[PDB]
Amino acid sequence: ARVTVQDAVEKIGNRFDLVLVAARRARQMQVGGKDPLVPEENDKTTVIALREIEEGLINNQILDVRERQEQQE
Amino acid sequence: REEAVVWDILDEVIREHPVLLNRAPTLHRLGIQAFEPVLIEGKAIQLHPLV
Amino acid sequence: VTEFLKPRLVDIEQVSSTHAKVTLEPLERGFGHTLGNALRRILLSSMPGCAVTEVEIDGVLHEYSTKEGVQEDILEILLNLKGLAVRVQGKDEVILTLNKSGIGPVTAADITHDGDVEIVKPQHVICHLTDENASISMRIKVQRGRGYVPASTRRLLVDACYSPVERIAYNVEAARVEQRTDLDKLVIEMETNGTIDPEEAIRRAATILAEQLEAFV
Amino acid sequence: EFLKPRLVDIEQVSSTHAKVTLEPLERGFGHTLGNALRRILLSSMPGCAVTEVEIDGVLHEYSTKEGVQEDILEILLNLKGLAVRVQGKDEVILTLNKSGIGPVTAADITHDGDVEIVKPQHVICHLTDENASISMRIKVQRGRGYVPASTRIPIGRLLVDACYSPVERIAYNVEAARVEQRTDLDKLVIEMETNGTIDPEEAIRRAATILAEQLEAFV
Amino acid sequence: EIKELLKLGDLPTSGQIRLYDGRTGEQFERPVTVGYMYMLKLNHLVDDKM
Amino acid sequence: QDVVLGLYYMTRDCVNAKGEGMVLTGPKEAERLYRSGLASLHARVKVRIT
Amino acid sequence: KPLVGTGMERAVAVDSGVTAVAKRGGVVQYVDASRIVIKVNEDEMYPGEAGIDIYNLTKYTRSNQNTCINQMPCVSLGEPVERGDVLADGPSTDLGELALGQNMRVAFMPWNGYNFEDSILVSERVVQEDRFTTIHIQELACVSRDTKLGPEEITADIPNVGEAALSKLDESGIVYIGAEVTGGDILVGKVTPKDVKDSSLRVPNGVSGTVIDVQVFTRDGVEKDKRA
């Protein structure tokens, strides 16, 4: 369940990077095959993506770390 | 055919998917907003009152 | 033709011990309000319970009054004595004491135990005493009754709220079944005073009502 | 230790409607049982309305039968309120056969053993020719609530709406009683308006059966 | 003339009746206007617009 | 439009209704007074708010 | 009837052409949904071409806006009538007045937000008593075009469908009078040679109803099938 995205704006301040970062992560969970880091509530991948933004464990930096790390591997 | 199993499928594709409502003479940028559906036995869009 | 959709409560999403939130799903179309009201007017107005009726002060024989040592007035002390929730055993009435001196808040724990009088919330602040020689002393009378009996209907005449509930409400939202069009989902939300847990006070509300229908079914 | 109500008197003020009395009541249960019993009696009572009329020479509900002054559809709106009582069945097929110039009232129906028309003066349609006669087969079945013609599930079967509701108007009044040196009690007087097919004791008993059955959910 | 015609009926003069709420079963404060209005259905029905 | 009429009817006062000048321990028994009918929806009352 | 009228209702319902105004007053001889037969008094009666009057009422036929113009008799058998009176109430007319909608018990109170801006809230009594239940009539054409590659047949031999399509047709391929179709059923079978492609008339989506009448028109030069 997700009603507003005010916490996500308070972690990613731009509010226009939120759609790009959360879209990229939601691609990495849907057709990226990867498993989420927060437990889902039979939700779609979008609410899981913003829901992981508001926890403090996904932004653009973490995605740089993981994609460069799999580019090494 | 509108079988019996398609409606739980439909409740499992609504749940977190927005739609865009639009009144036809759109003046300002609140003229298009986005909601989440709740299914209605009926034929009319039930819009939130304050909005 | 006779078989309705008899429900059972699917969840009790309860916040802390005096709070509860009972759902009931699903109910036949229109049965949201015939139970949400019938449990409302029985919980709110006619429930067996025990509460404070009247208090007399040792040196005060007037409602609009004053006293040294306690900064909250006698007009203000009766609000705490309304919310003083006491469960009582089979005594129909019993009188209590509050003889205490000292500095600081006088909670509900400073009443003597005295048999059947149990204090469910001992920490409930009744009055503050600010002086070292200030001494408070009063007779307070609990009584057994069946609903909100005010002071104007009935020593100081205090409002008698015998009923264990404080807040009840219900919000009939729709709830679908497999191929049924629309039904109800009774959402009973209740906060008590703490003399009884709120899972049981609903189960005393139907207990009163099913007795009322006994000469019919 | 609350008191208990009993059915103290059923004054049958007319054949259509009547007044029952619930007495005594503690102060506060009067509007509780009054609103609750009003709501149950209007919502859910077992009725016996017509369901599926099958006139003989008539193809569909929009044609006309030759020699009757009304359309087939106004015949359907006259039959829609044909108040009838059945006892030991659920469905039943009635048959109306009437010739001759004159009105076709409800008494022109075959008077099968448990099926009883309750209002014989009820007009259906008027015949207007010497040698002309409607001949229909009327299917009455039991039910509950309101089932429209769309939401259910040859060609001569005309489907009408079902209007399964014996009562029409409920009104109740609380007032004081004088039982035994004890004031502030309540007398509930439930004034129902029935089309004639349910006895008021049966209604006021089935209603509390429905409510006390609904309280099985948590006691 | 409306007031005297209502006096011929057994109805209140002001055209307002105390009404009881259907859900809760209690009297509305401030008795409401009731009466019979002639109302129309237009052919802008909803199963042409959808 | 309707909701401000409901609020404007809810927060006002008349000078003499039931429960005039009685003290109330919180908003919860203000709801409990109004739902029963011992008070009126608008009659002036000292309360303890937090 | 309108409870609160003006008195211009009589002049509109008479002066429009929807009611069956009696041309000569007399005694009603026969009343039927189809026709009303009026026997004439002796004063307004011609010596030659004497006879009586016969009014053929207009039954259920399509209006221009897909409503149902209808005429129903408002006099009974054996009743005196006067020159200039109504005999058949048309659409939206009752006993010679003009009655457009229906009049209902209305309250003026804001009821739980279900009438927020300008809405209306209607009880189940109004829908149960069938009193706004309007009757519409739609007219569905199905033409038989002479194109390239071959003419079009109106046969029932349709591929890609089973007995659910052909259950509601006769052997000619047109639906019966009064077979209650729904959305998706096939009214007129029609195939176009290509082996051959289905082009049959189908009920438009979302409507119900009863086939009340079937017209068949035929170009002079085509032999007729059995149903025509």
Indicate which CATH number applies to the domain containing G25: 2.40.50.100
| Segments forming the whole domain that contains residue A36 | 1-73
Q: Based on the domain organization, do G88 and G137 belong to the same domain?
A: no
Nearest C-alpha neighbor of G199 from the set G145, G149, G140, G139: G145
CA angle F36–F38–F40, rounded 5-degree value: 95
- DSSP lists the bridge partners of residue G22 as none
Which CATH superfamily is D47-164 part of? Answer: DNA-directed RNA polymerase, insert domain (2.170.120.12)
Which CATH superfamily is C49-162 part of? Answer: DNA-directed RNA polymerase, insert domain (2.170.120.12)
Amino acid (1-letter code) at residue E5:
L
For E45, the closest chain B residue by CA position comes to B43
CA-CA distance, A43 to A1, in Å (whole number)?
8
Q: What's the length of chain G? A: 228
DSSP secondary structure, chain A, as one string:
-----HHHHHHSTTSSHHHHHHHHHHHHHHTS-PPPSS--SS--HHHHHHHHHTTTS-SHHHHHHHHHHHHH-
**D64 closest CB neighbour out of G33, G176, G211:** G33
For C41, the closest chain E residue by CA position comes to E24
Between the alpha carbon of residue D87 and those of residues C169, D81, D147, the distances in Å are 42, 19, 21
Q: How far is D96 from chain C (nearest CA, A)?
A: 27
Please, are residues A58 and A11 in contact by the beta-carbon 8 Å criterion?
A: no
- DSSP lists the bridge partners of residue E43 as none
Interaxial angle between packed helices A45-53 and A17-30, expressed in degrees from 0 to 180 and rounded to the nearest 10: 130
CA-CA distance, D4 to C58, in Å (whole number)?
44
Contacts of D214 in chain C (CB under 8 A): 4, 6, 27, 31, 35
Q: Based on the domain organization, do G88 and G142 belong to the same domain?
A: no
Nearest C-alpha neighbor of E13 from the set E23, E2, E25, E22: E2
Name subunits touching E (3+ CB pairs < 8 A): B, C, D, G
Q: How far is F47 from chain G (nearest CA, A)?
A: 28
Please, are residues D205 and D20 in contact by the beta-carbon 8 Å criterion?
A: no
E34 touches chain G (CB under 8 A): yes
Q: What SS3 class is residue D16? A: coil
Residues whose CB falls within 8 Å of the CB of residue G221, separated by 6 or more in sequence, listed in order: none
* H-run or E-run covering E33: strand E32-39
Domain D1-46+165-219 top-level CATH class:
alpha beta
CA-CA distance, G19 to B20, in Å (whole number)?
50
Please, are residues D134 and G33 in contact by the beta-carbon 8 Å criterion?
A: no
Please, are residues C78 and C62 in contact by the beta-carbon 8 Å criterion?
A: no
Q: Taking the CA atoms of G44, G49, G54 and G55 in sequence, report the sign of the dihedral they define.
A: negative
CA-CA distance, F48 to C193, in Å (whole number)?
17
Residues whose CB falls within 8 Å of the CB of residue C114, separated by 6 or more in sequence, listed in order: C94, C96, C97
Nearest C-alpha neighbor of D79 from the set D57, D118, D51, D115: D51
**End-to-end alpha-carbon separation of chain G, Å?**
43
Number of helices and strands (H, E) in chain D?
A: 3, 14
G226: its two tokens: 């059995």
Interchain CB distance below 8 Å, E38 and G109: no
Enter the DSSP assignment of D123: E
Indicate which CATH number applies to the domain containing A21: 3.90.940.10
Contacts of E26 in chain D (CB under 8 A): 31
> Within 13 A of G37's CA, how many CA atoms are on the CB side?
9
Beta strands in chain D (DSSP E): 6-11, 17-25, 46-47, 50-55, 84-85, 91-98, 102-105, 116-117, 123-127, 134-141, 143-144, 158-159, 167-175, 186-194
Residue G68 burial class via C-beta count within 10 angstroms: exposed 0-12, middle 13-18, buried 19 and up: middle
Nearest C-alpha neighbor of C190 from the set C164, C159, C167: C167
CA-CA distance, A49 to A21, in Å (whole number)?
9
CA-CA distance, C55 to C35, in Å (whole number)?
38
Residues forming CATH 2.170.120.12 domain(s) in chain C: 49-162
Q: How many CB atoms lie within 10 A of CB D4?
A: 13
C150 touches chain F (CB under 8 A): yes
Residue G21 burial class via C-beta count within 10 angstroms: exposed 0-12, middle 13-18, buried 19 and up: middle
**End-to-end alpha-carbon separation of chain C, Å?**
17
CA-CA distance, G112 to G121, in Å (whole number)?
11
Enter the DSSP assignment of D147: B
Domain count, chain A: 1
CA angle G186–G190–G196, rounded 5-degree value: 120
| Segments forming the whole domain that contains residue G159 | 133-222
Method used to solve the structure: cryo-EM
CA-CA distance, G131 to G135, in Å (whole number)?
11
Beta strands in C132-179 (DSSP E): 135-136, 138-145, 148-149, 156-157, 160-161, 165-170, 173-175
Fold of C1-48+163-217: Gyrase A; domain 2 (3.30.1360)
Contacts of C33 in chain E (CB under 8 A): 23-24
Query: What does this entry list as its resolution, in Å?
Result: 3.7
CA-CA distance, G91 to D159, in Å (whole number)?
24
